[PDB]
């Protein structure tokens, strides 16, 4: 095996859910907000063509990746040129679009079409590489579940277009609501101060989704 970050996340979710944080005489959800736990990376767009090629995604920094159906991964860094390719074993190989690798043209070509299908820059100084990639994903009737290589799990809920970003290193959750406002909470402080029924319900769903990620392994 079980991934250690997913195991930690499962325990954190078990603890907050066991406190029944919405079933309280006094709910003070704002006191659990902690902007120091803000996620640096989240998935801003995705496109599911896994029936034929794979799942495309774009991160907040405008890098794009495709997780292909062979469990290999090709990422185009936000500079438009630098490529990271991850094998099924996890071995990482760094290339450029300028240099031409024949064994990867088809995947490189697909990545460009996926990028443009999702499309309608350095978002900060330096910060090259150490970019997370999509480890695995699955979808249900109500959500898509995205597990990133930095241990974060993002759950996008189709119906109301809300999102949860769970970070096990900081034991935090960021909730993006239908208005698209984002707020970051420490899970332990949600236990202490309570939260609304909606967030409590999504955290129960999240734990069920993390169980799935761990059972699939
Ligand atoms: O603009 C965003 C948005 S918009 C939605 Cl939705 C989620 C996020 N987000 C997370 S999550 N972490 N950081 C961000 N930022 C960056 C701004 C603080 C500088």
Author numbering: 369 to 488, 498 to 594
Q: What text does the study give?
A:
To characterize the binding mode of Allopole-A to PBD1, we determined the cocrystal structure of the PBD1•Allopole-A complex at 1.65 Å resolution. Analysis of the obtained structure showed that the two aromatic residues, W410 and F559, located 12.5 Å (Cα-Cα distance) away from each other, were critically required for Allopole-A binding. Interestingly, upon Allopole-A binding, the F559 phenyl ring present in multiple conformational isomers (Left) oriented itself parallel to the W410 indole ring to establish a π–π interaction with the heterocyclic aromatic ring of Allopole-A (Right). The W410 and F559 residues were surrounded by multiple hydrophobic residues (namely, I406, P407, I542, and I553), thus forming a water-shunning deep pocket (referred to hereafter as the W-F pocket). Analysis with overlaid crystal structures showed that the L2 loop recruited to a phospholigand-bound PBD1 traverses over the W-F pocket and is not compatible with the Allopole binding to the pocket. Unsurprisingly, binding of Allopole-A to the W-F pocket displaced the L2 loop by sterically inhibiting the I497 binding to the W-F pocket and altering the hydrogen (H)- bonding capability of W410 and P407 with L2 loop backbone atoms.
pmcPolo-like kinase 1 (Plk1) is a mitotic serine/threonine (S/T) kinase, whose overexpression is closely associated with aggressiveness and poor prognosis for a wide spectrum of human cancers. The polo-box domain (PBD), which serves as the substrate-recognition domain, is an attractive target for Plk1-specific anticancer drug discovery.
